[PDB]
């Protein structure tokens, strides 16, 4: 009856382009033993350089969520990790053949098709939840990023653009499908930004392919949004990723204030060293755990 650690059945391989760094990716992920975590692997260098997606190895936080080993890198993971805790994979080797995990159409959609093209196999071994017991709010100026106890899993954001294309959603995973409601928002980027951006050497994988793009008045991508609530979606869809850093699937509340990569692992960081705020549970049996998975 005990809700059980999950890794792949089989092995996933993608080539994509990173979304900062335009460059061509190799991207590999394998099963991995019981209490591996999501562990990233730098397989283009010798030798090769493995880094735990966890807080503790988070470096730069400006463009997306980086992690770092000395002078080693793996930037933008959020949308990665937003598909493994959004699918309840525990245990998982990413072999990338560069810096920057491949943006592939800006969403989770394609990494949730081809982890559940793969399928999953359940270990023999209790999952380990992050259970929040007090409410811990992190704030810098006007934005707040807040862990509220709840017997679930729930995440509400807001945003404030003042864009006229532009704000506020709540998604709660004993109603909402991850897969089908949140998985598929893509990231965007302001037309206006992007010549600054590429001077910065950042944005320089960009397209309509991988992003949606707004000029002043509109999207400019022909096809236009998959949901009215796109954007806010998108913001839903980091928060998950970048609380998976946690190393284990949460049972509590978050709610973002136009909060980002920073002060989200600002928050993660206040958490986990607040021990008085959290534990780590196990359901010895899934027909009284507060959260249930889909079928592997
Ligand atoms: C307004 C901006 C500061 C912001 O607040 N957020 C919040 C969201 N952040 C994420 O989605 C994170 C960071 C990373 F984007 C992946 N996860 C989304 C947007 C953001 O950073 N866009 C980054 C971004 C930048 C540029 C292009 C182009 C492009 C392009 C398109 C066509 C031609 C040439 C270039 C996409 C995207
Ligand atoms: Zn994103």
């Known amino acids: 009856s005990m809700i059980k650690q999950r890794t792949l059945k089989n ?11 335009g460059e061509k ?23 090769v350089v493995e880094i735990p997606a966890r807080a503790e190895n988070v470096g730069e936080t400006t ?17 990665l990790l937003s598909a ?15 810096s920057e995990v491949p943006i592939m159409d800006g969403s989770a959609g394609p990494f949730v098709f081809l982890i559940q093209s793969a399928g999953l196999q359940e270990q023999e071994a209790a999952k380990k939840f992050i259970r929040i017991k007090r409410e811990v709010s992190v704030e810098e100026g006007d934005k707040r990023a807040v862990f509220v106890p709840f017997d679930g899993f729930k ?15 709540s998604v709660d995973f004993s109603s909402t499908s991850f897969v089908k409601e949140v998985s598929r928002a893509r990231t965007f980027g302001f037309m206006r930004d992007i010549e600054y951006l590429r001077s910065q050497n950042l944005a320089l994988g960009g397209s309509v392919e991988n992003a949606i793009v707004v000029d002043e008045n509109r999207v400019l991508n ?7 609530d796109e954007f806010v979606k998108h ?23 136009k909060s980002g990569h920073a002060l989200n692992n600002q928050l993660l960081r206040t958490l986990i060293a607040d021990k008085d705020a959290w534990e780590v549970v196990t359901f010895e049996d899934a027909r009284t755990a507060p959260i249930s998975y889909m079928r592997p």
């Open 11 to 21: 092995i996933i391989r993608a080539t994509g382009v990173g979304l900062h760094s």
């Open 25 to 47: 990716v190799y991207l590999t992920l394998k099963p991995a033993p019981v209490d591996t975590g999501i562990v990233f692997s730098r397989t283009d260098l010798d030798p």
């Open 63 to 79: 463009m997306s969520t980086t992690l770092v080993k000395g002078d080693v890198k793996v930037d933008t993971v959020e949308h």
């Open 84 to 98: 493994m805790a959004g699918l309840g994979i525990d245990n998982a080797y990413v072999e990338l053949s560069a």
């Open 155 to 169: 995440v509400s954001f807001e945003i404030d653009f003042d864009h006229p294309v532009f704000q506020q959603a």
């Open 222 to 228: 022909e096809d236009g949004l998959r949901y009215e």
């Open 235 to 257: 913001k839903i869809l980091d928060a998950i990723g970048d609380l998976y850093l946690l190393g284990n699937s949460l049972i509590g509340e978050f709610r973002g204030f």
